[PDB]
Every structure is written in structure tokens, then in C-alpha cells.
Amino acid sequence: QANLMRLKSDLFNRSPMYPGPTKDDPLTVTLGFTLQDIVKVDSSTNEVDLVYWEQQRWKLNSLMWDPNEYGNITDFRTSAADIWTPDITAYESTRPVQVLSPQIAVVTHDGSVMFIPAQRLSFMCDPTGVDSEEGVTCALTFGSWVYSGFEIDLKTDTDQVDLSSYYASSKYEILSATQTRQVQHYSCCPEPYIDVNLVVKFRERRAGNGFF
Amino acid sequence: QANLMRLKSDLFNRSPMYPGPTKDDPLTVTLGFTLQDIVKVDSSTNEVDLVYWEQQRWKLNSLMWDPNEYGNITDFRTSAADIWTPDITAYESTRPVQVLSPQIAVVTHDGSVMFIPAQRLSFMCDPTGVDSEEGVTCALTFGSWVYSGFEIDLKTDTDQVDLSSYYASSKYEILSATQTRQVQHYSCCPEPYIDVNLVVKFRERRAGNGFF
Numbered sequence A, B: 001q002a003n004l005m006r007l008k009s010d011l012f013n014r015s016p017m018y019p020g021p022t023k024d025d026p027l028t029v030t031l032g033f034t035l036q037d038i039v040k041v042d043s044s045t046n047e048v049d050l051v052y053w054e055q056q057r058w059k060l061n062s063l064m065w066d067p068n069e070y071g072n073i074t075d076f077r078t079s080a081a082d083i084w085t086p087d088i089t090a091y092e093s094t095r096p097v098q099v100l101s102p103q104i105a106v107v108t109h110d111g112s113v114m115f116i117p118a119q120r121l122s123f124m125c126d127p128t129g130v131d132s133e134e135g136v137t138c139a140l141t142f143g144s145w146v147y148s149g150f151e152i153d154l155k156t157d158t159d160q161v162d163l164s165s166y167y168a169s170s171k172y173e174i175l176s177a178t179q180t181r182q183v184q185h186y187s188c189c190p191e192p193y194i195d196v197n198l199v200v201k202f203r204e205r206r207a208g209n210g211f212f
């Protein structure tokens, strides 16, 4: 309605977009994973396919407004394309990510943003032994592709992956799933890079729905 | 044992073998099945492979002896080739039976015989639906190939198939298995023939070893 139109116009039509973080003005991105399904393993290529929701949060001064000036609006939904978003990337993917949901963020009056896209990703993982009781463990790291820890820091709110929406009749059951902040280096550059390490231990489900 | 050698010589060396039953001298064969494994199903040919032990009992007057005359021997094992055996045949087999055990019978002084060969058999059975909770039912009839009920009658001691030796980690679990005496007629002949109807209801096993 009228007040929201005013707010979007004011935030988006009169100043250049935020040019991303810098050493002088770094940004911390909070990451969290909701693992929905391990869809497929490929033992001939050592690729495993996950469906997850990637919760991203961050805060920009440039996205702040006074609710009093905008009919007491305290937050709004807007296309992710309307705002700056962090280049958080899976470091061991083997196919382009497939986006399974709209890409729309919620912006709150204090400048904070919540963005949770659903994604399917193939990544590097040797699934040998998945059909046993002990299962198998794979790891996948997520971090900025181009910014070091001098510009983008990462944080999780919990080290436990959210499994409350995990598909109960998946071919695979989850034995454990953790998300932990780490600090990695790459050959291109000397600077400290930050990642979140997603560690999933899983095995073929042989109990529950479809099992009698 | 000298006494046993005498007995076998006296029984097997000095008279023509039993020419089989007749209308004037009919015979009753007791049958019982021990189902050990449902090994394989073939949904492209509608054949299923069973492993079972087939317990057969009958009694011949010509196999009697007085234990007093033979050092109190009341029974002995001997090769099934030494004695007459009934032509009990599976009527819906699709391959020759494969024998998995020695063929040796126990003969008792009253002329009674017990013979329990282990067998693998492929038979006519549509396995469609075996991977469901309801499973599938197949039936297999066993009886004399050439003797009518006027020469060979059949009997079971129980209508329950013995499942006490069924392979706990089979691909298939048994939902029920019965063995029931019936009467049948074939195009070739007007006389009633007797059979035992083996009816097995089963499904893919999804709870037990290999499952967690």
C-alpha cells in the first residue's frame, strides 16, 4: 500500500546501491542450514546431492528507516535483486546450484535482512559405506567467494544443523549434522578466509515409512 | 556292525523290490514342508525360487523285521536308492528340482520310512506387489505324478508349514504358509488324484538384520 510504496521508493530510488563491505567497514553474515533431504548419491562419481534452506542474515545502515515516518512499517518483503546480497558459496560443488524457491528477502527497520533460499546442490562426497550401520560422513564448506575475513566475517547462531524439516521418507537418514565456523586459506591469496563447515553423517534408511 | 550288515543283506538281496502301490494295496504318504528360504523372484518370467525340506513318511510291510533277530536294531539309515520311494512331484515347477542334501532314508522295524530331502525349486508365481505391506500369495501343489487316489493317498500332520528354520535375513519375509490336502483331476484321466496345496504369502523383508 501507500506507505510501503513510499518506503521502497525512498530506500531504492535515490542513492547508489551499497557497494559491498570493505576493510574499513566489514560485515558479519550469520549462516544457518535447514537440511531437507539427501536426494541422491553417486558412487561412480563421488557426488552427493542435497536439498537445504540456507538462512542468511546481515545488517546494513543504508537499509534503516524510522517506522514513524512510514505508517509504522517495521519490516517488508522485497526481491533479493533489490538489495545487496553476500556471495556465500559452496566451495566443493560439482554442478551449478539449483534454486528451488523465490528469492525474496525480509528487510527490518534497523537495517537487518533475512534471506532463506532453498537450493539443490551436488557436491564432492565419497558415499562408500552409506549402506552400512555406521554410514558415511561428508563435509562441505560455505564462504564468500571473493571477500576475505577482513571484509566478510561469518557466524552461526547454533552449531546444530536444523533437521526439523528433514524428509522422513528420504532414502537416507541423518545420524548427525553440524555447522561450524572455520578459517581457511587458498593458493591465490595470503589473507585469512572464513567458512562454515557443514558436516553430515548419514546412511541408507532401513526403518520407518515404507518399512514393515 | 555285523547285525546291521545282516539286516540290510536280508532286506535288500533276497526278493524283488516293492512294485509300488495298487488298487488292492494302496499307500498313504504323509507330507510336511519345512520352508527354509524364498531365494529369488523373477518378475519378467513370473517364476519364484524356494528352498525347502520335504518330509515324506510311508510304511511298507516288506520293510519289516523282528529286532530280536538282529541284535535289537529297531531302525537304520540307508540310501534312498535302496528302497522304493513315492513319486511326489511339484505340479507347477518351471525347472528340474535341485537336490541340496544327501538322499538317505531312515527305515524302522515296523516297515515305516522317513525321508527328508532338501530341494531348490523354481515354480510358477507372479511376484508383482511383493514390495508392499500386503505382499503377494503363491500356491504350489505336490502329489503323485502317476498314481490316483486309489493307489496313493496323501496326508499332512499339520496344516502349518514349518517355519522354524526359515532364513531370518532372507530378502523375503513369510506372512503365512499353509499345507493342505486337496483333490484334483487332470485332462488325461477320470480318476481323482490327491495333492497337497502349499500356499505361501510373502513380501520383501524390511525389518531385521541389515535394517536399523
Ligand SMILES: NCCc1c[nH]c2ccc(O)cc12
Binding pocket: A103, A104, A105, A106, A114, A115, A116, A117
Ligand atoms: N519458506 C520458509 C522460509 C521463510 C519463511 N519466511 C521467509 C521470508 C523470506 C525468505 O527468504 C524465506 C522465508
Ligand SMILES: NCCc1c[nH]c2ccc(O)cc12
Binding pocket: B103, B104, B105, B106, B114, B115, B116, B117
Ligand atoms: N537334516 C535334517 C532332516 C533330517 C533329520 N534326520 C533325517 C533322516 C533322514 C532324512 O532324509 C532327513 C533327516
